[PDB]
Amino acid sequence: VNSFSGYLKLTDNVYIKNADIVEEAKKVKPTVVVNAANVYLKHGGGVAGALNKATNNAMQVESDDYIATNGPLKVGGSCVLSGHNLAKHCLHVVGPNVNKGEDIQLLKSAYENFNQHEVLLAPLLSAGIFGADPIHSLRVCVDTVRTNVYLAVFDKNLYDKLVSSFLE
Ligand SMILES: CC(C)[C@H](Nc1ncnc2[nH]c(C(=O)N[C@@H]3CCN(C)C3)cc12)c1ccc2c(c1)S(=O)(=O)CCC2
């Protein structure tokens, strides 16, 4: 169960690995995988598109049905849906998209959703094309998450910069 391997322990509850979250989910079979979602759960590209493709679009159909009944999420919010073949559950979390003018302060609310789950496999929220400074996102994660989080960051260059930043 939750067979995470090759992670570097940063704090007593935050671990990090240079890895593709999709490959990690297939191997580890975590209780929860976090999706870096948008408010309409449209998994069009990046991490969300990669996780949806790994479910052969089952995540997208389920997401459309959730939105029809419940309406969109708020920025900083989340919902729990099926993990499909990747996990028992997927926690869809909306971090702020700084490139589209959303407030970076909502990154704390986004990470706070992780605290309702004992163990999670997750990406670095609001990084990549969402525009947040990835060293800042790691600092918010470490300061906010209290449950056990395994971060998969699919870029060795960024991984090395994040670990060097944490260890200063
Ligand atoms: C910073 C970046 C390295 C990181 N990327 C990732 N981090 C962790 N696991 C990842 N898998 C893939 C991928 O494409 N998986 C594919 C499956 C099959 N393919 C071989 C490859 C990307 C990726 C990341 C972190 C957060 C966010 C983004 C990107 S974003 O999608 O630009 C906007 C939402 C927030």
Swiss-Prot record:
Described function: Responsible for the cleavages located at the N-terminus of the replicase polyprotein. Participates together with nsp4 in the assembly of virally-induced cytoplasmic double-membrane vesicles necessary for viral replication. Antagonizes innate immune induction of type I interferon by blocking the phosphorylation, dimerization and subsequent nuclear translocation of host IRF3. Also prevents host NF-kappa-B signaling. In addition, PL-PRO possesses a deubiquitinating/deISGylating activity and processes both 'Lys-48'- and 'Lys-63'-linked polyubiquitin chains from cellular substrates.
Catalyzed reaction equations: Thiol-dependent hydrolysis of ester, thioester, amide, peptide and isopeptide bonds formed by the C-terminal Gly of ubiquitin (a 76-residue protein attached to proteins as an intracellular targeting signal)
Regulation: Inhibited in vitro by GRL-0617.
Organism for this UniProt entry: Severe acute respiratory syndrome coronavirus 2
Part of the full-length chain shown: 1025 to 1192 of 7096
Membrane topology: Multi-pass membrane protein
Protein name (database record): Papain-like protease nsp3
Description of how the protein assembles with itself and partners: May form homohexamers. Interacts with N protein.
Domain Macro: from-to ranges: 1-168
Cell compartment(s), UniProt: Host endoplasmic reticulum membrane
